[PDB]
Design a protein around this ligand. Sequence first.
Ligand SMILES: N[C@@H](CCC(=O)N[C@@H](CS)C(=O)NCC(=O)O)C(=O)O
Ligand SMILES: [Zn+2]
Length: 405
Amino acid sequence: SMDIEFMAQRAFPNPYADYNKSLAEGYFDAAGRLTPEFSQRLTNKIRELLQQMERGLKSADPRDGTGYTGWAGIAVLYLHLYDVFGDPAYLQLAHGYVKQSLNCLTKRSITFLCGDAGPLAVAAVLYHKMNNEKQAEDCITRLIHLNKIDPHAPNEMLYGRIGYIYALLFVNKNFGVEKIPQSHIQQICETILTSGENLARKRNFTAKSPLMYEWYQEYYVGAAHGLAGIYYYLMQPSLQVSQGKLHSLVKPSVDYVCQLKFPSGNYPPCIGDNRDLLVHWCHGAPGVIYMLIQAYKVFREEKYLCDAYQCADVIWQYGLLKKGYGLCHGSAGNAYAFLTLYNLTQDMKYLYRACKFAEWCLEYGEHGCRTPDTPFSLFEGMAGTIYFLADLLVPTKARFPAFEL
Ligand SMILES: N[C@@H](CCC(=O)N[C@@H](CS)C(=O)NCC(=O)O)C(=O)O
Ligand SMILES: [Zn+2]
């Protein structure tokens, strides 16, 4: 491309005035409940997009059942719709999509987004929502008996171990009961730790940073294939890291990555990388923030939170992506940043920015954006932009899908 020098080339000049009490009124009240007039627009655009999406999937690859770009992804969207809208046509649609995604298993990856973890974990909860334990319990055992498959697997989101964790947490979250024994989550989380300190020695960070992780011959900073993603998961009460192991091991590793940030506030794609232009959830501030906020939650130190703000100001400035409107690397996925901040801070400035990003999404296709490689997919495509819009309806429950927790 021509746009290789800096963030500003990748992005659109943000045209929206920044928050004040007055402008927020149009979007939400002092309770941060969205004006029905606004929910109405969001919700009309959702119905409108869903039509195009549904027509689009007719020509989508029958072969791909990934969360990331295939049917299981769409199943995910619909289960989230059936939740936000009660409309049982969504639970039907979801059923047809997990049906489809279960003919796509290749037994060759273990993550929610790119491997059999997606179709299985999603089919599990769907079959549950349909009062149908026969298959619910059947998918469970196949999700579990996935473990022994890539024993030398990586650690990150898309192919790594946290990616398989999420699939398990997703099931448990959606049953409420602990259907996957805690010990089985503990199994895998152990080996991700012991392997992150080994790597850290062999390479000699273990002084500068007790833990280290890599994938595809790089140390990945960000959320998709990276440290930020992996640490975020380790600071996660659901994983249960010893209060000591949390301070001894993970805290300084985290701090190492913080130290990594560009002057701009952004974060390098890769360790040693010094091209400052990716504002994606997959690479940069918009994915790094989840770690920062989760760190402020558990260590309660003003620097973590002060970085999150710093993330957000960058995303606010450079998050409207020429890339398009998707979750992995697009305006929708970027907006989720703001919601996560907002849900911690409660500072209405952030719920506002999220809304103003939705304002952009509502002009889907009006900007010159290249259409995504898979135009209707959860993560590169329309299904994701839609996902956000629906999630935004009720901010406090908004979670970046297939990841956030
Ligand atoms: N397949 C994607 C294109 C992926 C592209 O946006 N690159 C992603 C890969 S996860 C990101 O790493 N961007 C790299 C860059 O912009 O240099 C689509 O067409 O929607
Ligand atoms: Zn990406």
